[PDB]
Design an enzyme around this catalytic site. Structure first.
Site, short mmCIF file in Angstrom:
data_model
loop_
_atom_site.label_atom_id
_atom_site.label_comp_id
_atom_site.label_asym_id
_atom_site.label_seq_id
_atom_site.Cartn_x
_atom_site.Cartn_y
_atom_site.Cartn_z
N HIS A 41 0.90 -1.49 -0.09
CA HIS A 41 -0.06 -0.05 -0.39
C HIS A 41 1.03 0.89 -0.12
O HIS A 41 0.08 2.19 -0.85
CB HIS A 41 -1.26 0.02 1.13
CG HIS A 41 -0.85 0.44 2.62
ND1 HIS A 41 -0.12 -0.51 3.55
CD2 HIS A 41 -0.37 1.47 3.26
CE1 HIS A 41 0.64 0.37 4.71
NE2 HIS A 41 0.64 1.38 4.37
N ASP A 89 -0.31 -7.26 1.98
CA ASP A 89 0.08 -6.14 2.03
C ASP A 89 1.77 -6.56 2.35
O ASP A 89 1.85 -6.15 3.01
CB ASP A 89 -0.49 -5.41 2.73
CG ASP A 89 -0.25 -3.93 3.14
OD1 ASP A 89 0.25 -4.00 2.01
OD2 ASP A 89 -0.99 -3.06 4.12
N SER A 183 4.00 1.84 8.69
CA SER A 183 3.36 0.20 7.65
C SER A 183 5.49 0.13 7.08
O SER A 183 5.97 0.93 7.01
CB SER A 183 2.53 1.04 6.37
OG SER A 183 1.96 2.02 7.26
N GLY A 184 5.27 -0.84 6.68
CA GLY A 184 6.16 -1.49 5.99
C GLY A 184 7.45 -2.41 6.82
O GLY A 184 8.70 -2.77 6.81
#
Length: 228
Positions: A41, A89, A183-184
């Site tokens: 994303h 994701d 995120s990530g």
């Protein structure tokens, strides 16, 4: 990172900053000499810009002996990832060249054995995302220890009534969390990469639903095929 503290400079050498035109966009994990694992994303957010990844960093702005910026040669999002959906994701980034490894830059091993982390276990999550409700962004790497919830509690809390997949894992979000910008980033349990930070908390500091992280063991076959 909500409720954490400043990490020790370069003590987590696998930490990567995925940047969009110089600004930190998402966290990432060096899983090999030329590969950075992050969340798919994160690419949606970068519609027309130049994505690069910063390694060997603590402070995002201060000059440091181990900082090195790299261009991304190829971006490989999970084949089954569907924008505005939460599963699959995962994003694999290939660097323009193999990274210069050293004490401040080194890959982290990832879980290839598909087994659940024991509920109650405290895992480490690092990142340069928002730290408070005000939207304040830190210059230096932050980190928190989060307890992993059991699956049934994850299932019930997140989804409501119908399953949380076997490819996801939850960690409490109540006073400590991952927020936008995290995120990530890795979720490390006992020295091994166990999960990858999924969407961060919508409003940093006020979500009731637990944090969700993608289990990498559930994707060991995919990761391997991309690195081959």
């Amino acid at each position: 990172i909500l409720g954490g503290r400043e990490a020790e400079a370069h003590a987590r050498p696998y930490m990567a900053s995925v940047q969009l035109n110089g600004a930190h966009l998402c966290g990432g994990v060096l899983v090999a000499e030329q590969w950075v694992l992050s969340a798919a994303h994160c690419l949606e957010d970068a519609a027309d810009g130049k994505v690069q990844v910063l390694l060997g960093a603590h402070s995002l702005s201060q000059p440091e002996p181990s900082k090195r910026l790299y261009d991304v040669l190829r971006a490989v999002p999970h084949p089954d990832y569907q924008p505005d959906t939460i599963d699959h994701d995962l994003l694999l980034l290939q660097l323009s060249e193999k990274a210069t490894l050293g004490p401040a830059v080194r890959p982290l091993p990832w879980q290839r054995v598909d087994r659940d982390v024991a509920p109650g276990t405290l895992c480490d999550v690092a990142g340069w995302g928002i730290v408070n409700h005000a939207g304040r962004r830190p210059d230096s790497l932050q980190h928190v220890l989060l307890p992993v919830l059991d699956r049934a509690t994850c299932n019930r809390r997140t989804h409501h009534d119908g399953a949380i997949t076997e490819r996801l894992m939850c960690a409490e979000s109540n006073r400590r969390d991952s927020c936008k910008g995290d995120s990530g980033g890795p979720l490390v349990c006992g020295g091994v990469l166990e999960g990858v930070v999924s969407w961060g908390s919508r409003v940093c500091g006020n979500r009731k639903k637990p944090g969700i992280y993608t289990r990498v063991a559930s994707y060991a076959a995919w990761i391997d095929s991309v690195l081959a």
